Amino acid sequence: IITPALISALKTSFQKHFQDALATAPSTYLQVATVIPSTTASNTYGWLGQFPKLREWIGQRVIKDMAAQGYQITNKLFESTVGVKRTDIEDDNLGVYGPLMQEMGRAAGAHPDELVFALLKAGNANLCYDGQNFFDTDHPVYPNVDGTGTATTVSNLFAPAADPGAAWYLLDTSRSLKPLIYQERMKPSFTSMTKEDDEQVFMADEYRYGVRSRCNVGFGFWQLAAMSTEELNQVNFEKVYDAMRNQKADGGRPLDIRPNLLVVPTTLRSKAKEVVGVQRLANGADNPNFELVQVLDTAWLN
């Protein structure tokens, strides 16, 4: 009645279903995130900060003593499972139980994007290495390389006096690191737990199936990312662009920032088109910012 052949065939069918569902799932975090695989509990990120530069070597070779502080990514774990109910063995009604595996593949493929974009939206409620919010009006900027003396207040969060509108983000991808980092301790894996001599199977009436994964997402350095709840207009976009591109490191030296793409929800696609991607301005003159940035509309931002 029960032989290894049938169990193997069903396991292969379920594995094929799940793998097909997951492989074709869209990937979007890679564009605005950096993947850093690891083989431990966490990774230390103390190199984010100062911008490396070149000196004239007037005297001796300067050696940088890196700070001992770390970001403490502290990756996490999470997963989901179902059962089969064993109903198929008797009647072989295998038509059902497909959409469940498809849903698993979709969820596994799409979760990292959801987490990355949720962290991106939560920048106003997450602390960076500076000890303050990611989008804050009092970021630390010292006047000396050693990092001492009175600092200056820099703000990259803009909001009208009241009734703030939709929120749009401006990011950069030219650098090696994207503003957000998506860790990956282990790729998601599925376990075809179905045995006749196992337990909670003979005493229950289910063939449980589960998936496992380990990953987490964290912020990078705020020099690039910018946020603004202002209405997406030419003047506001130009102000944000020129404020971000005019960033100076310690000692008032420009960083040569090159904003690449601007992220808006699917609701503001029309405004993104009007600002960039069309040859008509509001007044009807030729754009001075045509195809300047590559817009990336997404549903994860509503």
Added chain:
Amino acid sequence: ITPALISALKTSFQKHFQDALATAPSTYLQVATVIPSTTASNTYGWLGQFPKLREWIGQRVIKDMAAQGYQITNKLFESTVGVKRTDIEDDNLGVYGPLMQEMGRAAGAHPDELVFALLKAGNANLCYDGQNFFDTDHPVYPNVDGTGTATTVSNLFAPAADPGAAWYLLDTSRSLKPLIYQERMKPSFTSMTKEDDEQVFMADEYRYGVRSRCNVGFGFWQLAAMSTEELNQVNFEKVYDAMRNQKADGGRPLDIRPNLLVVPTTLRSKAKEVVGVQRLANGADNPNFELVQVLDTAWL
């Protein structure tokens, strides 16, 4: 000046260093535990789970299950010594060679002052619970079910801002010693002796420093006790009764017998009438010359 001479010198120095570091009078081993680590940080699970056994059968009947974690964040230490400007090629190496065995002895006892640094500053270190180590809200479990209810008591003794010296009562019978000692690499010996080396052309002070990585942490909070009030026979008996009366979940006795006592040198007078006289103190009057004999350390 040949490579064979360098090899022989390195072998002799290695033998001298290995001779020490082994017979040093270590005192941390009484209250610390040796643990082989592999990474830069080690997390923890349970923090107050007394391992005990129950009548029921199976191997799955009762257990506490772990809670939020506690990291060590292993630190680093180093020593260094060497004066060979005139020792080498002068037959003066007979000295500068046996004197550093004391350096090895002293360095091998460093975990002692590390654990005592943790011990002295136990009130300024964050505990996994959230409050100070010696707080008055230490959770106690009435039953084994999730987080049912955490009652507490004034665990330790402290008067109304009365002057005194802090003396600690410790136990070491259980291998779950109150402190922890995590080491990543054992002490290592490095030889930079290289003929006509670029940076060691300077006379012949051949650097012979060492490298080590280790740290210490907190284990059980109940295994340790503190007292800043005036040291007296009545107060000593009170402290001993309070510590021995400690009971875990379910009211099952613990049999915890205190073994170690730490006192500053200033309180040494009282710590000597308490221990060492069988006539009037810890003797005729409240005889208590049996347990927790004072050790009277001075690294605090």
